[PDB]
């Protein structure tokens, strides 16, 4: 009657009430980091590479245009449906990362600081994570739901909206999270996966840098460049804050992308992939599992564009060929080139991740597209085939860390906000660009003998420190961001910050049709394609509380 129907109880789980206990508070904290390693898959890498195929840096790759059709649609800007499974997917996954942050915060809020002295640094950690996801959702969808009430009941989520806040104050609610993190994180993290205070500053800065190019109108065009926001990017990339944490540029560019050199001075905050670690096949970067070349059987995604290749060409003084670069293919024998090309793009006749025993060819053995998507391979996320760090599960993946903020990003973001605040500090921003440009010109360890063996002519030089116009300085920063962050899945995100997407990409569609035939029918529709549509199922479940982005029909 009664004792009989209570005896059996849940086996092998912690129940809802129990989870709040302090003995589990640090379990929840770790779990909220884990999901950045264990929550993405081959079509939703929290590096967001699958979506930077929209950029002029690269093509989606694969077997053909149907190998992830929804991402070809994204690549050519045509036949995107708000009902598409990827768009829903990434929306859903990123809000899942948010859950683990908030669940930990719900536990951490109730803790007593007298008896848990790190209470506020843990809380900061989680709020850093929460800002990470909201930031990326903001880049992806513009009109997002702000989920930052860790004590909110399940039912109250039903009455949320992606317009509770204006666009600018959506951006600010992200900034608030990374701000508290700055105020509270320690200067140094002996456990390197935990963000240090400089990381919180850098992401704080990045959030205001995206907030400052405002779109306060109803569509997506620029409505003016705010300089209270820009002045924050300066405040929070102050080199004095960065030195308190010991960050700086590695003496050679390639270190940011090499297993032996994880957690270096430039790695401001990275996702700590690992191997031999108790999990089925390892906490490898499965999200890049598609982008290994055919030398490993599969799958040849994330291939760089000839556009990006030619961008590393330099004139006879070691400066970008600003106007002419894409009018003739890079030719090894006769062109001056930036060393960063050989750290970004593996090209036929050249070594795959610095290994003379694997020379790339226009073959069955390297590319999968019979030429459709070209013959270039993405170098940054791949690793030496011999590497201890490389294992095959269902795909090939490594333990190479994904760095979310390289310290080069911090210098070039400072450079930017100075140049935009025309206020006399431009010759400083130029001197920041030369920090990166000079570092890059000397990054020829591991490719030192490419002159004699393959014939390449490395030539890169800093800009002379003159009093540059703001228009001319911008295009020099932009050009440094092209070569410095190629294939790191923020190129297209940059163009939508700059309001330049339709112009630069629709242009790319015609210049590159010649090389990659998929762009034949491609067309970017401005005030529409700068942001993915909010997912249809998401709007439809909201019962009118969610609002679709501009340019998309009432479905």
Partner 1 sequence: DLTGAVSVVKVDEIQKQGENNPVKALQGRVPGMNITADGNPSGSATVRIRGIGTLNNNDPLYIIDGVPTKAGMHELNGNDIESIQVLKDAASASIYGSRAANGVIIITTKQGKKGQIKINFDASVSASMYQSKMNVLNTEQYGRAMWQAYVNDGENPNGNALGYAYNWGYNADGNPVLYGMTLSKYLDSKNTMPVADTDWFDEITRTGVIQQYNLSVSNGSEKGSSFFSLGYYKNLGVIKDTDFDRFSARMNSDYKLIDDILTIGQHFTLNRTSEVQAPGGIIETALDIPSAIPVYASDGSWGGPVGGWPDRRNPRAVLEYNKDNRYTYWRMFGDAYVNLTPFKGFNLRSTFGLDYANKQARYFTYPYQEGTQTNNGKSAVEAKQEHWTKWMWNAIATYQLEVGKHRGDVMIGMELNREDDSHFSGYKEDFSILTPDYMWPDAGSGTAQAYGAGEGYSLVSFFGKMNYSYADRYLLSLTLRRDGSSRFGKNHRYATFPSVSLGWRITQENFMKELTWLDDLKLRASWGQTGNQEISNLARYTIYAPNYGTTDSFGGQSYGTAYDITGSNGGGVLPSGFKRNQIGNDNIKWETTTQTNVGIDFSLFKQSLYGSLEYYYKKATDILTEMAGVGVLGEGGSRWINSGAMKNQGFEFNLGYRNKTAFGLTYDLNGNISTYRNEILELPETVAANGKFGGNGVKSVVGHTYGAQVGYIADGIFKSQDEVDNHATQEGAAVGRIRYRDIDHNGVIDERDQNWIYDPTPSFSYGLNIYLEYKNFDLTMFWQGVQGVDIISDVKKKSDFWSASNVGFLNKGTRLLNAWSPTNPNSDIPALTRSDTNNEQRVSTYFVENGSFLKLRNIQLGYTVPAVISKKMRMDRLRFYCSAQNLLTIKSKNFTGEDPENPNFSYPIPVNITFGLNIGF
Ligand X SMILES: OC[C@H]1O[C@@](CO)(OC[C@H]2O[C@@](CO)(OC[C@H]3O[C@@](CO)(OC[C@H]4O[C@@](CO[C@]5(CO)O[C@H](CO)[C@@H](O)[C@@H]5O)(OC[C@H]5O[C@@](CO)(OC[C@H]6O[C@](O)(CO)[C@@H](O)[C@@H]6O)[C@@H](O)[C@@H]5O)[C@@H](O)[C@@H]4O)[C@@H](O)[C@@H]3O)[C@@H](O)[C@@H]2O)[C@@H](O)[C@@H]1O
Residue ranges for the known binding site for Mg(2+) are 53, 55, 262, 273, 399, 401, 519
The 3-state secondary structure of 398-426 reads ECCCEEEEEHHHHHHHHHHHHHHCCCCCH
Contact 212, 230 (CB under 8 A): yes
Question: DSSP assignment, residue 281?
Answer: S
Q: Give the pair of three-digit tokens for residue 299.
A: 């799958």
Q: Can you say which residues are annotated as belonging to the binding site? A: 53, 55, 262, 273, 399, 401, 519
Question: Site map for Mg ion, 271-300, x if CB under 5 A?
Answer: --x---------------------------
Name which of 13 and 240 has its Cβ closer to partner 1.
Answer: 13
Q: Give the pair of three-digit tokens for residue 488.
A: 């790191």
Among 19, 31, 34, 41, interactor with ligand X by CB under 6 A: 41
CA nearest to 412, candidates 304, 312, 266, 307 = 266
Name which of 66 and 452 has its Cβ closer to partner 1.
Answer: 66
CB of 208 to partner 1, least distance (A): 25
The span of 29-37, 171-179, 219-227, 343-351 binding partner 1 (CB under 8 A) equals: 29-37
Footprint on residues 76-95 left by ligand X (CB under 6 A): 85, 89
Q: Give the pair of three-digit tokens for residue 72.
A: 């070809």
- 296 lines the binding site for ligand X (CB under 6 A): no
- 65 lines the binding site for partner 1 (CB under 8 A): yes
Strand 301-304 relative to strand 58-61: parallel, antiparallel, unpaired? antiparallel
The residue written with tokens 């860390």 in the block is: 401
What is the rounded CA–CA span in Å between residue 71 and residue 87? 10
Among 119, 194, 406, 481, interactor with partner 1 by CB under 8 A: 194
CA nearest to 96, candidates 40, 55, 141 = 40
Name which of 246 and 297 has its Cβ closer to ligand X.
Answer: 297
The span of 91-99, 170-178, 226-234, 475-483 binding partner 1 (CB under 8 A) equals: 91-99
Name which of 129 and 147 has its Cβ closer to Mg ion.
Answer: 129
CA-based torsion, 449, 307, 68, 496: positive or negative: positive
Question: If contact means CB under 5 to 8 A according to the sort of partner, which of ligand X, Mg ion, partner 1, none does residue 89 touch?
Answer: ligand X
Question: DSSP assignment, residue 189?
Answer: -
Among 399, 434, 548, 549, interactor with Mg ion by CB under 5 A: 399
Q: Give the pair of three-digit tokens for residue 152.
A: 């909110």
Among 56, 57, 67, 252, interactor with ligand X by CB under 6 A: 67
CB of 280 to ligand X, least distance (A): 15
- Rounded (10°) angle between helices 197-212 and 407-420: 40
Please report, as ranges, the residues that interact with Cl ion according to CB under 5 A: 15-16
Please report, as ranges, the residues that interact with ligand X according to CB under 6 A: 41-43, 62-63, 67-68, 85, 89, 298-299, 394
């Amino acid at each position: 009657c009664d004792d009989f129907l209570d005896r059996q109880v849940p086996q092998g789980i912690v129940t809802g009430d129990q989870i709040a206990s302090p003995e589990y508070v640090d379990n929840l904290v770790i779990s909220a980091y884990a999901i950045w390693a264990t929550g993405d898959d081959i079509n939703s890498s929290f590096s967001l590479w699958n979506y930077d195929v929209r950029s002029d840096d690269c093509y989606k790759g694969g077997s053909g245009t149907e190998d992830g059709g929804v991402f070809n649609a994204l690549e050519i800007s045509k036949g995107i449906n708000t009902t598409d499974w990827n768009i829903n997917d990434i929306w859903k996954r990123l809000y899942q990362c948010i859950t683990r942050a908030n669940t930990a915060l719900q536990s951490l809020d109730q803790m007593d600081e007298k008896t848990y002295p790190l209470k506020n640094q843990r809380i900061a950690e989680m709020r850093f994570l929460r800002g990470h996801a909201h930031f990326m959702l903001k880049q992806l969808f513009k009109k997002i739901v702000i989920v930052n009430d860790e004590n909110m009941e399940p039912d109250a989520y039903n009455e949320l909206s992606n317009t509770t806040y204006t666009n600018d104050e959506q951006w600010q609610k992200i900034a608030d999270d990374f701000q508290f993190a700055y105020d509270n994180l320690p200067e140094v993290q002996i456990e390197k996966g935990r963000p240090a205070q400089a990381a919180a500053a850098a992401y704080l800065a990045k959030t205001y840098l995206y907030k400052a190019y405002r779109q306060d109108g109803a569509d997506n065009a620029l409505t003016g460049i705010n300089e209270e926001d820009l002045k924050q990017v300066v405040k929070y990339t102050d080199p004095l804050i960065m030195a308190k944490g010991g960050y700086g540029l590695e003496t050679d560019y390639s270190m940011n992308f090499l297993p032996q050199y994880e957690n270096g001075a430039e790695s401001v905050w990275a996702i700590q992939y690992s191997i031999n670690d108790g999990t089925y096949n390892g906490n490898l970067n499965w999200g890049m599992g598609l982008t290994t070349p055919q030398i490993l059987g599969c799958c040849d995604f994330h291939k760089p564009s000839q556009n990006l290749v030619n961008a590393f060409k330099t004139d006879s003084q070691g400066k970008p060929l600003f106007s002419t670069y894409d009018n003739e293919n890079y030719e090894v024998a006769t062109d001056n080139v930036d060393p960063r090309l050989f750290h970004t793009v593996g090209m036929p006749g050249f070594p795959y991740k610095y290994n003379e025993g694997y020379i790339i060819q226009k073959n069955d053995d390297w590319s999968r597209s019979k030429g459709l998507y070209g013959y270039y391979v993405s170098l940054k996320e791949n690793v030496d085939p011999d590497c201890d760090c490389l294992k095959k599960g269902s795909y090939w993946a490594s333990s190479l860390n994904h760095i979310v903020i390289r310290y080069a990003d911090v210098l070039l973001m400072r450079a930017e906000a100075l140049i935009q605040l025309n206020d006399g500090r431009i010759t400083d921003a130029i001197s920041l660009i030369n920090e990166v440009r000079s570092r890059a010109a000397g990054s020829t360890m591991l490719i030192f003998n490419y002159k004699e063996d393959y014939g390449v002519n490395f030539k890169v030089t800093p800009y002379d420190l003159k009093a540059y116009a703001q228009d001319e300085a911008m295009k020099m920063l932009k050009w440094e961001r092209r070569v410095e962050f190629g294939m790191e899945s923020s190129r297209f995100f940059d163009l939508v910050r700059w309001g330049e997407a339709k112009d630069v990409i629709n242009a790319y569609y015609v210049t590159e049709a010649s090389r990659c035939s998929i762009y034949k029918n491609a067309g970017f529709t401005e005030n529409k394609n700068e942001y993915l549509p909010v997912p249809f199922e998401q709007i439809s479940a909201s019962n009118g509380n969610y609002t679709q982005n501009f340019g998309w029909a009432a479905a």
